[PDB]
């Protein structure tokens, strides 16, 4: 019995929510205690550049943006069941980190 935290980081929300739902369903099918998923504030990286490769013309700017989303799940359980439920969780684009506090 350990307090185990799962942190999920992703760039798109559909895959992230699908993975979170899968983990919650899998854990609750084993009659476990789950807290979350608690959603951290979204991070927005911005890069503003000039469009022209030279210095000629109207001053126009590109505004590129990247969004990072983060979820937390808490589980009171032994390590083996967590790895059992986590093995399926592998999804393209989602970074899953499991820690024992």
């Amino acid at each position: 019995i350990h307090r185990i935290r799962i942190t999920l980081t992703s760039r798109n929300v559909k895959s992230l929510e699908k993975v979170c739902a899968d983990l919650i369903r899998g854990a609750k099918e084993k009659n476990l205690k789950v807290k979350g998923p608690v959603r951290m504030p979204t991070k927005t990286l911005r890069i503003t550049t000039r469009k022209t490769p030279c210095g000629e013309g109207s001053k126009t700017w590109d505004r590129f943006q990247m969004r990072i989303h983060k979820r937390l799940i808490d589980l009171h359980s032994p390590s083996e069941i967590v790895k059992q439920i986590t093995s399926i969780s592998i999804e393209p684009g989602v970074e899953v980190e499991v820690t024992i506090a």
């Binding site: 760039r11 990286l45 890069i47 550049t49 000039r50 469009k51 505004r63 590129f64 943006q65 990247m66």
Partner: protein, 55 residues
């Protein structure tokens, strides 16, 4: 000798210590988030990196 003089000038800071990681150009460099690209190379590779234009 030549071994001492060649490349002796320190290059631990300034424009001469930094260059683009794609074309080795020292002008218009982007250092935010550790990109280390010039603006043209970044505009060329932005979609591959993951920067999208939403506004």
């Amino acid at each position: 000798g030549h071994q001492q003089l060649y490349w002796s000038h320190p290059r631990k800071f300034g424009q001469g210590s930094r260059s683009c990681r794609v074309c080795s150009n020292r002008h218009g460099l982007i250092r935010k988030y550790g990109l280390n690209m010039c603006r043209q190379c970044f505009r060329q590779y932005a979609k591959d990196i993951g920067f999208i234009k939403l506004d």
